[PDB]
Design a protein around this ligand. Structure first.
Ligand SMILES: CCCCCCO[C@@H]1O[C@H](CO)[C@H](O)[C@H](O)[C@H]1O[C@@H]1O[C@@H](C)[C@@H](O)[C@@H](O)[C@@H]1O
Ligand SMILES: CCCCCCO[C@@H]1O[C@H](CO)[C@H](O)[C@H](O)[C@H]1O[C@@H]1O[C@@H](C)[C@@H](O)[C@@H](O)[C@@H]1O
Lengths: 273, 273
């Protein structure tokens, strides 16, 4: 039993909650988590979370994982995959039942710019992910402050960049040179998505990360680096293959930079100052 | 090129546009048809529409089909399947390119109450629907007045009953006897869906119509007829298997009964007076 939805009452009066292609934009007040948790638990949903922690960023893993255990997908099956050049430096964090962590070592400047999309592409294709239903790909220099759960899950999602959710499209920092595979013309574009939080089913994350990696290789062969690297390619991809959910900036925020505006009812996953 | 969606501007301020399980509720102003038409045409989407026209209701087929040709899925591949006890009386209506019609003869009072779900179940399982991607199941005593297009398409959809979209759940005319397979308790239920317009992918319409038919057979064996026949079973089904889109009453209206309220910007598919 849960409160009856009310057809004549908007779920939010201050923000857009569905895109023009009918993908939900996920804000607090738009979902009932009990119904979603039931639907996803009925499928024994397993969520993989990938995170890169390279060089001095390995220091952010302790708080990232401690707070993920408090707030990410609690009650569902979770497997963290930590990609790092220092596997020995991964903190031993105690995990709830049904949750596990694997450490994946990274080897070996444009190839580093390509590393995230290349490595997730290769990894997402492996047979040991047979049990994993969705992949969520986030940055490590962050903490969870509030619920991040199965409301986000869908075949393909991106996240509204916290600096640009209010901007008109010509102000978006899309790649603007026609020479680059990431090019988006002045008059095109739905949203500016941030590279720090995207995901989807395993098949849709294989497709996204393969397309971004292959596009970046083409740019490198031509001597061009997109203005915001794999984020520029992510935006080009999501423009052409529209996400089936879009996460609001509740899911990717910087409070030191941007404070706490009235349109954010919760700050769920935030930059570490 | 299309107008940029505006994150800080609700798509509607007067109605709920997403359910608590994050399924879009389809109202005018919530979608951009050009983007949807592109996505669906890229998949060469074929829509089957089923309609029953029995005894004197065969008289409603001429206006139903003439207006469907003006307003239903125009530009996409459509196949009408007319189920009738008078195949000879089906009007010869001229169809646009890419659109065809087949006539399916019905044979042979509780078995008539079961006929729609039984017949669609049997039909949806046939190999000649290999090319068909979605099934839309509507009543014949209706006309199209305005656009009904691929915005509705999704794995599973129901339609808000025009008499009840404003009602609280205890006022819903759900089956209330625990003896019936359609039973829904006082404190349960999201919406009251009408049996006159439901649909989804072929697989989801096989599942819905098989479950409703099998449930109604169980009730008949027990000497119970649900209060609103297959509509009572439809509601029980959609309560347990939540629809991935819900159509607003723009898609199922009676203007003689209910007029033209401010929350309806378009009257798309309406009862014939
Ligand atoms: C003091 C730096 C403020 C920069 C705000 C704009 O954010 C940056 O936007 C570009 C695209 O234009 C990239 O997405 C870049 O990674 C963003 O900066 C990072 O995210 C912001 C929100 C803030 O946390 C910065 O400190 C990060 O470097
Ligand atoms: C004069 C009759 C007014 C009835 C309004 C309520 O609609 C009926 O609701 C039940 C469930 O409670 C069934 O869904 C039934 O089929 C509905 O009646 C039909 O639809 C209404 C909207 C109107 O067009 C009636 O004339 C139909 O019989």
């Amino acid at each position: 039993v849960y409160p009856q939805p009310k057809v004549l009452t908007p779920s939010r009066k201050d923000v857009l909650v569905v895109t023009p292609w009918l993908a939900p934009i996920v804000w607090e007040g738009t979902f009932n988590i009990d119904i979603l948790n039931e639907q996803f638990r009925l499928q024994n949903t397993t969520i993989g979370l990938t995170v890169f922690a390279i060089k001095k960023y390995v220091a952010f893993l302790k708080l990232f994982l401690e707070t993920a255990e408090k707030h990410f997908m609690v009650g569902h099956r979770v497997h963290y995959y930590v990609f790092t050049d220092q596997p020995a430096a991964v903190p031993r964090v105690t995990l709830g039942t049904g949750r596990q962590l694997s450490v994946l070592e990274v080897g070996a400047w444009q190839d580093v710019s390509m590393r995230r999309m290349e490595m997730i592409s290769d990894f997402s294709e492996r047979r040991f992910l047979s049990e994993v239903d969705y992949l969520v790909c986030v940055d490590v220099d962050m903490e969870f402050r509030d619920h991040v759960g199965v409301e986000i899950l869908t075949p393909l999602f991106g996240t509204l960049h916290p600096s640009f959710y209010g901007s008109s499209r010509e102000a978006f920092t899309y790649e603007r040179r026609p020479q680059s595979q990431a090019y988006i013309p002045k008059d095109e574009g739905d949203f500016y998505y941030m590279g720090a939080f995207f995901g989807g089913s395993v098949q849709e994350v294989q497709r996204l990360t393969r397309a971004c990696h292959q596009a970046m290789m083409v740019d490198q062969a031509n001597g061009i680096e997109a203005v915001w690297h794999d984020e520029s390619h992510l935006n080009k991809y999501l423009l052409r293959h529209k996400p089936t959910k879009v996460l609001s900036p509740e899911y990717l925020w910087d409070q030191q930079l941007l404070g706490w505006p009235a349109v954010l009812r919760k700050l769920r996953f935030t930059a570490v100052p």
